[PDB]
């Protein structure tokens, strides 16, 4: 069932059968979160989940794309993801199209840009860690000293957290390694998105659009408090369809909202299958 | 040419031909505003426009629906509108469905609800007319204004400003009076659920004149306010501002998509 970074959610038949749906993991979760979507798709639809790898968004796609091709050849490709998953799905669509492959569906489940770009500057790193430290004071009922900004501001997101965690440890707080790994992994995967180099795409994209980001996403990054009607995709995708679903980003992957996603995606898959004839 | 409130933009051939597109006027405009859209729609598509009549939004569609049925009989109905005209088109779709008619396309060109409800209270009436005075770059007695409906408000304020010594040509005053009231009528529209496919062509934002008119137009939701009324809702982002959605080059993005929709309907006959 787990082979490297590919999880089999529903195996395709030994030969022929329906076009598989490739789903991509969200930050801090695995592709098991697509089980409710799978239940709202047509019977016998195969589904494979791509789990986390390292690198920039671009680098991650360079690892996925050869694997996609080993599995599915020239196409057709159906690529779906919620949250960071949607960004990874799109980046895969881009890589596959560069190689001449047939991409027929790109389904983005509330994968919505920050309402303003996230500056990649020393000043923003300072302001971000001052916010985080303020929340940590309240929560851990503790006084945080002067931040060693000169050191943090030269590191990448991984290095910044590694520095903060080494400081927390020789502060005298010992965190269970599984909580560290989970928190660190989630944080860095969500930060990867901020510097995704989005390329134009020539095919059809379907954006399932919730009303707003949830509170934990806004705590993470305050610029998620505002969103545009096109989720930031309009300049890159001329053939863009938006399917409003309401609710919050965190709800979009679960029952009951996922039924709306599934009903729509089911018709799109049905159209792809009939076309294949 | 024109017959009552019905404008012929392109008459359908006397037998056969394509399904007509029915368009509805925006505030302060005529249905001639749809000619650029028509240019981007399939060749020989008939088009008829419904021009201004009196009433609440619902009363207007009470006049339009008998007329629609007069022209097209059973269906298929294709209803399109920009701005106020989207709201009118939608109100017509609701009336036609009550009469059992076949509505196959409802095209809303950036017909987007204000980000919050416009309160129907005396303090809002006061706030509103204060904001309009300040766009002077007179004085207004509130006790009287705040008891009047929209029609009486606008006539009362116009009377105070000519009494002040300002001279605006009567034809301009009248055109601005009905533009104002037609947009204001949308605020109390009683939106009903619709059981078919709606396509909402979605701009990035309202233009500045719209926000000056009603500041709540500064904020919009991803569904344009329609999600609670329409379960089969498709949003087609088009970018730009409201006022540009009806013109070249943005109307080409509308027309390219609409043209695929209408071709699907022609085949299915
Ligand atoms: C602590 O919990 C969280 C914290 C933050 C998030 C949101 C992360 N952001 C996204 O999912 C997301 N960005 C985009 C997106 C979409 C389009 C873009 O360019 C056009 C783009 O340019 C960088 C980004 N598409 O999706 C989710 C969380 O919990 C699940
Ligand atoms: C001075 O120039 C202007 C001033 C104001 C406007 C905007 C008027 N508003 C609209 O076009 C409009 N409201 C809606 C809408 C849509 C959905 C609704 O509920 C579901 C709703 O419930 C009240 C309203 N759909 O469209 C346009 C202007 O110039 C063109």
UniProtKB/Swiss-Prot annotation, chain A:
Made of a minimal module holding ketosynthase (KS), acyltransferase (AT), and C-terminal acyl carrier protein (C-ACP) domains, and additional N-terminal ACP (N-ACP) and C-terminal thioesterase-like domains. This is Polyketide synthase Pks13. The active site is at residue 83. The lineage of its organism: Bacteria, Bacillati, Actinomycetota, Actinomycetes, Mycobacteriales. Identified as a drug target. Fatty acyl-AMP loading is inhibited by thiophene (TP) compounds, which kill Mycobacterium tuberculosis. Overexpression of wild-type Pks13 results in TP resistance, and overexpression of the F79S mutant confers high resistance. Structure-guided methods identified a highly potent and very safe lead compound, TAM16, a benzofuran class inhibitor that targets the thioesterase activity. The thioesterase-like domain is inhibited by coumestan derivatives that possess excellent anti-tuberculosis activity against both the drug-susceptible and drug-resistant Mtb strains. Changing residue 83 to A: Cannot form alpha-alkyl beta-ketoacids derivatives. The chain holds residues 1451 to 1727 of 1733 of the full protein. Involved in the biosynthesis of mycolic acids. Forms, with FadD32, the initiation module of the mycolic condensation system. Synthesizes, in coupled reaction with FadD32, the biosynthetic precursors of mycolic acids, alpha-alkyl beta-ketoacids, via the condensation of two long chain fatty acid derivatives, a very long meromycoloyl-AMP and a shorter 2-carboxyacyl-CoA. The acyl chain of the acyl-AMP produced by FadD32 is specifically transferred onto the N-terminal ACP domain of Pks13, and then transferred onto the KS domain. 4'-phosphopantetheine is transferred from CoA to specific serines of apo-Pks13 by PptT. Residues 20-113 are annotated as: Thioesterase-like. The gene is pks13.
